[PDB]
Amino acid sequence: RRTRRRNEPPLDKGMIPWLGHALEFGKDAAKFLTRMKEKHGDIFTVRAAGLYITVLLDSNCYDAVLSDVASLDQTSYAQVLMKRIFNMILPSHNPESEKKRAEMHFQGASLTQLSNSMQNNLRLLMTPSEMGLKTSEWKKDGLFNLCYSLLFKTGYLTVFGAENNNSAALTQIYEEFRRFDKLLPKLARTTVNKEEKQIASAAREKLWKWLTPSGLDRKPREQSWLGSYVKQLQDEGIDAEMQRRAMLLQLWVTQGNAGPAAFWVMGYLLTHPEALRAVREEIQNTPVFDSVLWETLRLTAAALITRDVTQDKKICLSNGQEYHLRRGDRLCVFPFISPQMDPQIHQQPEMFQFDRFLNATEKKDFFKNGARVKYPSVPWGTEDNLCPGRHFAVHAIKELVFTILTRFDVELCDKNATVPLVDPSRYGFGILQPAGDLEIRYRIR
Ligand code: HEM
Numbered sequence: 066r067r068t069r070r071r072n073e074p075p076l077d078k079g080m081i082p083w084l085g086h087a088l089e090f091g092k093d094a095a096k097f098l099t100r101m102k103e104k105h106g107d108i109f110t111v112r113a114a115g116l117y118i119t120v121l122l123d124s125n126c127y128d129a130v131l132s133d134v135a136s137l138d139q140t141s142y143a144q145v146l147m148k149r150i151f152n153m154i155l156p157s158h159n160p161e162s163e164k165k166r167a168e169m170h171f172q173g174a175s176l177t178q179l180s181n182s183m184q185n186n187l188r189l190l191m192t193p194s195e196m197g198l199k200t201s202e203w204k205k206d207g208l209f210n211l212c213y214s215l216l217f218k219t220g221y222l223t224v225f226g227a228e229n230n231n232s233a234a235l236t237q238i239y240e241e242f243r244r245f246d247k248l249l250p251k252l253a254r255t256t257v258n259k260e261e262k263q264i265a266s267a268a269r270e271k272l273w274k275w276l277t278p279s280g281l282d283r284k285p286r287e288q289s290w291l292g293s294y295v296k297q298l299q300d301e302g303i304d305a306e307m308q309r310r311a312m313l314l315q316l317w318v319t320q321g322n323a324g325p326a327a328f329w330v331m332g333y334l335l336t337h338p339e340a341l342r343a344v345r346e347e348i349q350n351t352p353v354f355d356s357v358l359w360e361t362l363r364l365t366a367a368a369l370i371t372r373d374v375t376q377d378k379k380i381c382l383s384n385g386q387e388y389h390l391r392r393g394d395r396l397c398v399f400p401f402i403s404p405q406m407d408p409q410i411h412q413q414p415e416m417f418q419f420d421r422f423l424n425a426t427e428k429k430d431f432f433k434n435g436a437r438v439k440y441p442s443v444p445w446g447t448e449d450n451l452c453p454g455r456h457f458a459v460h461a462i463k464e465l466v467f468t469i470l471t472r473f474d475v476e477l478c479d480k481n482a483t484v485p486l487v488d489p490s491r492y493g494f495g496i497l498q499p500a501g502d503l504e505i506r507y508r509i510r
């Protein structure tokens with residue numbers, strides 16, 4: 066029987082013994098945590114599957130709290146998730162030497178080269194023939210499926226240097242990946258039913274084979290990002306089978322957000338003609354588009370930054386009140402709920418307004434009840450630990466949007482359509498994914 070100690074957050078066990086709020090937290094994390102915020106405020110502790118999870122939603126505390134890596138561990142949870150989702154183990158892996166390299170390969174001159182290759186690869190994949198325009202003037206597709214297809218294939222070819230895969234082989238990989246990706250949330254939660262466990266297992270196995278071209282004598286490039294990664298695993302005594310499985314882990318890490326983000330960007334522009342105009346005008350340093358991307362990320366970048374509490378920690382909210390986390394609990398931080406979707410910070414937060422971050426110049430002054438908000442949106446995580454793939458991802462999103470808007474005419478099938486609702490299963494996992502899709506048609510401009 067867990068009991069609240071002095072200055073611990075509000076405690077909400079739910080009614081189901083042991084299990085607590087696990088189901089509901091899992092089904093839709095935004096709805097459930099919003100519910101709890103309303104009930105309890107900016108900090109509260111929830112029971113889920115025998116564990117107690119403290120959630121911090123006071124955005125000005127995020128950095129200072131998360132900077133404390135002595136009290137807050139990413140690694141052990143990442144292990145469990147790695148096992149549950151990717152059917153993977155990496156005994157004796159040092160995550161530190163590979164965190165450093167991920168940061169170096171995706172910035173500076175290293176990023177310039179990858180971005181160049183990304184551009185070249187996107188051009189190869191946006192040929193009339195690649196766009197399915199060999200049979201008619203117009204081609205019907207879902208905007209989401211199209212945006213993911215194009216960025217997945219570009220990211221893949223660029224980051225893995227997998228030109229060994231032909232046009233139809235890339236389509237097969239993407240489609241298999243999608244079956245895996247679709248199931249990744251349930252898989253992360255251990256909520257997979259019989260059929261879904263089999264589909265997941267089947268997709269993983271095809272991908273493990275396809276992503277490592279075993280039969281080919283392709284000398285590894287050990288100075289590349291992916292090559293140095295495999296070499297490290299090999300030097301750590303990690304067997305060939307696990308190397309093969311790490312490829313699917315690295316595929317998700319690098320390809321599972323950008324295409325989806327580009328979908329939302331395009332979705333919002335196609336449904337907001339004034340935003341589309343201001344972007345199209347600009348396409349002839351891009352302050353407008355910058356704002357459009359940042360708005361899109363406010364609405365759809367929903368990582369649930371999670372940590373295990375390794376030691377008791379005293380924590381302070383903006384009002385000065387003090388709370389105690391206890392060793393063995395989890396801590397979650399959710400910038401989606403606040404600041405991104407906080408109505409006291411961004412008025413009408415459910416609405417896409419392209420200029421939200423433009424003055425009458427970048428808008429940088431934001432407030433909650435007269436308090437300065439340093440970070441009005443937090444898609445890349447916290448200032449101490451910013452996503453190392455962000456510059457690459459933004460480049461890629463720009464490149465797709467630019468290209469589509471310039472070389473294609475793209476129309477919504479239903480003239481009055483809006484962007485689909487969000488598939489709530491996605492909250493916590495990065496860029497959100499549409500419930501259904503946005504039906505479009507396109508042609509060579
Ligand atoms: C729209 C695109 C993306 C978004 C919104 C996003 C979001 C995030 C967030 C919020 C974190 C912080 C995780 C944490 O603190 O626990 C993170 C970390 C990370 N991201 Fe991304 N990401 C994106 C794209 C990418 C891409 C394209 C790559 C690879 C090229 C990538 C690689 C990584 C890696 C390796 C980390 C781990 C940092 C660490 O904890 O050591 N991400 N991402």
Ligand SMILES: CCCCCC/C=C/[C@@H]1[C@@H](C/C=C/CCCC(=O)O)[C@@H]2C[C@H]1N=N2
Binds near residue numbers: 318319371494495
């Ligand atoms: C505890 C899980 C840590 C996972 C560390 C690997 C980072 C993965 C990033 C992901 C962002 C994280 C989303 C929520 C993961 C939970 C967390 O990092 O606390 C996706 C893929 C890549 N960029 N975007």
Ligand SMILES: CCCCCC/C=C/[C@@H]1[C@@H](C/C=C\CCCC(=O)O)[C@@H]2C[C@H]1N=N2
Binds near residue numbers: 143144153155157
């Ligand atoms: C939502 C995220 C789910 C994907 C799982 C993320 C996996 C994260 C691993 C992290 C730590 C996991 C295991 C390290 C210990 C290896 C072991 O003993 O199995 C970092 C980055 C990657 N490898 N090291």
Ligand SMILES: CCCCCC/C=C\[C@@H]1[C@@H](C/C=C\CCCC(=O)O)[C@@H]2C[C@H]1N=N2
Binds near residue numbers: 086091094118492
């Ligand atoms: C990685 C963040 C996205 C996950 C979406 C929410 C799902 C599961 C967990 C939440 C609790 C909900 C169910 C507990 C089952 C997870 C487990 O067995 O570890 C919070 C955040 C994560 N760990 N604690």
